[PDB]
Design an enzyme around this catalytic site. Structure first.
Site, PDB file in Angstrom:
ATOM      1  CD  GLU B  57     -45.757  -3.896 -18.045  1.00 15.63           C
ATOM      2  OE1 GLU B  57     -45.977  -5.104 -18.294  1.00 15.63           O
ATOM      3  OE2 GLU B  57     -46.329  -2.952 -18.636  1.00 15.63           O
ATOM      4  CG  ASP B  71     -42.273 -10.072 -21.443  1.00 18.93           C
ATOM      5  OD1 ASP B  71     -42.668  -9.784 -22.598  1.00 18.93           O
ATOM      6  OD2 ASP B  71     -43.075 -10.275 -20.504  1.00 18.93           O
ATOM      7  CB  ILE B  73     -45.888 -14.324 -18.711  1.00 19.88           C
ATOM      8  CG1 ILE B  73     -45.529 -15.268 -17.565  1.00 19.88           C
ATOM      9  CG2 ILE B  73     -46.924 -14.973 -19.643  1.00 19.88           C
ATOM     10  CD1 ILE B  73     -46.712 -15.759 -16.790  1.00 19.88           C
ATOM     11  CG  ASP B  74     -44.321 -11.831 -25.269  1.00 19.36           C
ATOM     12  OD1 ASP B  74     -44.132 -12.165 -26.458  1.00 19.36           O
ATOM     13  OD2 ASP B  74     -44.756 -10.710 -24.926  1.00 19.36           O
ATOM     14  CB  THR B  76     -50.783 -11.916 -20.067  1.00 22.10           C
ATOM     15  OG1 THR B  76     -51.320 -10.786 -20.754  1.00 22.10           O
ATOM     16  CG2 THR B  76     -49.415 -11.572 -19.494  1.00 22.10           C
ATOM     17  CG  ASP B 201     -42.528  -7.365 -25.270  1.00 22.84           C
ATOM     18  OD1 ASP B 201     -42.648  -8.433 -24.629  1.00 22.84           O
ATOM     19  OD2 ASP B 201     -43.344  -6.428 -25.144  1.00 22.84           O
TER      20      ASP B 201
END
Lengths: 253, 253
Positions: B57, B71, B73-74, B76, B201
């Site tokens: 994304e 992903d 940074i899961d 944020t 995710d």
């Protein structure tokens, strides 16, 4: 009281965290370490300060003589499930007012300590709360009480609903009120709130949450009441209220 | 594909965790590291496997050629609040089926990795899910979607209410679906569920949750559907169902 007890508490907190960190090593009957920890802590302070009183797990009845409010293991459920979020909390009071607090995050090995008039520290670093006044940029922490009946968990969901509706920047449920209060103690969170948490859970966390900016009040806005199983802590009085004002009295003790 | 990419992913995951752990060092515009991380990861794999595709994304459109679902940074929000629960997740697929997954807990420095047919490991330790079939002894994890409208958070509270009502041994909301899936991946949790979480995710978390006993299905019980922003993972098919069966279709994508 002051210094000597504070040091004794730290050392006990650490030794305790170790036995519980170690106890977590391998594969619901490990409610023995809970005792062993509470036994270690109390049998030693009760032998170093014979005139002191102790509060732990009606019971909570605080006097004016120096009393220790202890929670040998916060987050037994996490513990029983090996979910790495469990703590040991030792708060100390004298003259019916909280003097210091020590909280150890057993697995992460983080030692939150706060002495009134001496500020808060987590492993040497000096904690400061956030300045968050806007409930739309707040990261709220909470805990689902021990109950489960449809009535009590009607206001729980609704109360969370109100914060969420309030356009709350986010809510977390880590299963450890003490450690959640410690996140708020540092930048980590902007506010915490709950009903059904006992006096030994907020005793130590309050000296810290306070010594670092922060505010801890009643779910009503009134002054903090240890006896009532309810609290609302936050970065600032602003936030402390929006949360409280938007809550809805539930009932525990 | 296999080995070479897997190693490349690990090394990127680690280098990434470092830049983000470091980025957490001091005092909402640090959505640049997100790019930098995703930029690091992609610019390198896109240069080592030029024929590969990348998903990160509508967008998620999985083909049969080896594609990376990333992903950077899961969590944020946790990141923006310095709440120590954030991750980097790199999953790899080929032939439209998940091959391996790598997830790094940046602060705790925990590296969850799972290769299909090769099991799951967290920092060398081999993960195994719990055997929990009883929803009354289950530790359920979840996440509040990104929405906030009264309608969507009507079934959210109710759905949690159903699990709680179901006499659910406990629920946690850590703000990081990947890392929550990793707890379930290990003993830590017995089940996870959610709506509104995207394909990047659960891509990596699924190879792991599977390679360690575990089950990941649809909030309907049907087979897992990456495209639908919804999943239900658990220790066993028993639990996987009680959770799903008791859920109530909400709507994201």
């Amino acid at each position: 009281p002051w210094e000597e007890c504070f040091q004794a508490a730290v050392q006990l907190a650490l030794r305790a965290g170790q036995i519980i960190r170690k106890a977590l090593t391998e594969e619901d009957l490990v409610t023995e370490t809970d005792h062993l920890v509470e036994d270690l802590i109390i049998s030693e302070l009760r032998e170093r300060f014979p005139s002191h009183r102790f509060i732990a797990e009606a019971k909570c009845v605080l006097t004016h003589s120096p009393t220790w409010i202890i929670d040998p293991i916060d987050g037994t459920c996490n513990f029983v499930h090996r979910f790495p979020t469990v703590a040991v909390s030792i708060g100390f009071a004298v003259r019916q007012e909280l003097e210091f607090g020590v909280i150890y995050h057993c697995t992460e090995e983080r030692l939150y300590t706060g002495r009134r008039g001496r500020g808060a520290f987590c492993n040497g670093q000096r904690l400061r709360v956030s300045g968050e006044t806007d409930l739309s940029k707040a990261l709220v922490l909470t805990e689902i009480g021990p109950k489960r009946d449809p009535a009590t968990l009607k206001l729980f969901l609704s109360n969370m609903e109100r914060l969420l509706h309030a356009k709350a920047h986010g809510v977390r449920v880590i299963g450890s009120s003490t450690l959640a209060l410690c996140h708020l103690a540092s930048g980590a969170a902007d506010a915490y709130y709950q009903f059904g948490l006992h006096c030994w859970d907020l005793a130590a966390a309050t000296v810290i949450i306070r010594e670092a900016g922060g505010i801890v009040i009643d779910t009503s806005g009134g002054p903090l009441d240890l006896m009532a199983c309810r609290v609302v802590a936050a970065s600032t009085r602003e936030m402390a209220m929006l949360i409280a004002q938007a809550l809805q009295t539930i009932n525990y003790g």
